[PDB]
Amino acid sequence: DNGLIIGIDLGTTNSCVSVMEGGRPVVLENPEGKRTTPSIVSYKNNEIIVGDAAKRQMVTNPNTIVSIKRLMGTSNKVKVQNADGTTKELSPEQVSAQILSYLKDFAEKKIGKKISRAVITVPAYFNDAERNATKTAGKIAGLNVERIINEPTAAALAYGIDKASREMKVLVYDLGGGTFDVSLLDIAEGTFEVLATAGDNRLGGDDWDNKIIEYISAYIAKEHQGLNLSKDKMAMQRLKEAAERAKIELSAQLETIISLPFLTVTQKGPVNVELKLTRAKFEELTKPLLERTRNPISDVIKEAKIKPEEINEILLVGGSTRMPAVQKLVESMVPGKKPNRSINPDEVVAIGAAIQGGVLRGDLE
Ligand SMILES: Nc1ncnc2c1ncn2[C@@H]1O[C@H](COP(=O)(O)OP(=O)(O)NP(=O)(O)O)[C@@H](O)[C@H]1O
């Protein structure tokens, strides 16, 4: 009853699990060797597949469920089809529980012990029904959910901001795969207060991917008309994979090559893609997405009735904050301050959850 409390970031796009070990948070690798796991679940009767293997069929398999977080707290159901043609209705709690179960299972094997306790994170804007859905998901997965904490709070814990000696105002800019959250926190006496939030729950790294897809589709259109490219699910799965890969490479390099031999066929033979995409062109194509992240910063400043100079620290959270242009935009909006991105931005929320778990378990060594 007083064992380890793991920390879980249950994201729209990806999930991550961490635990305290020897007085430091450790991020646990899944069985594919990855430190994050896609929040994606595929159903084949009783055989349920989670994570990377499910992401590889997200476009091609009608019984693969993505983006379930968006339904948490509602009584909407998702449907999957059994082998015998009957339909199975699933709650968001049930599908989320499969992601939580997968994390729990591989965590147990890595740690070498059974695990029955967790802290799970949620967006700051989640209401009681949304939080309760998340707790229920944990319960279905065999986890006593010791606390639900907010994602920006978790990130601040990871950076140790609660240990600050003076009162701190902290801006959290969190750009994930599906959603964009800006939060202004006040941390005083080791307690967190959310002063203001803003953002767009329909804006995230997927949109940047989708712009590259749009671009490739327009390239194809210069040489081919009437292809009906969307109806080719195989082609669409490949385009999504290629787009995300190209985007990621452009966070580190100034150019990337998109190569898609035999993408689809026309009456004159195969359609191929060989395109060099520079960072500058990628940034021009995605400028409207980037710019949409600016006003939410100013929104939180306005609502909290602060001046920009009152922001003591900025935290970059979410995988998309690896993009150079995003970093630059944030710098431009809080002049003088160097944002924090030293803790891997797609692990920082889970790390904070794990620190919260250690605190709840007690025992100072
Ligand atoms: N190096 C990189 N450069 C650019 N984008 C990246 C990089 N690494 C990861 N991403 C993107 O980060 C996004 C996933 O962010 P992540 O923070 O893991 O999502 P999440 O926690 O599920 N949050 P959310 O989707 O908003 O509910 C995807 O769009 C990835 O392609």
Ligand SMILES: [Mg+2]
């Ligand atoms: Mg996130």
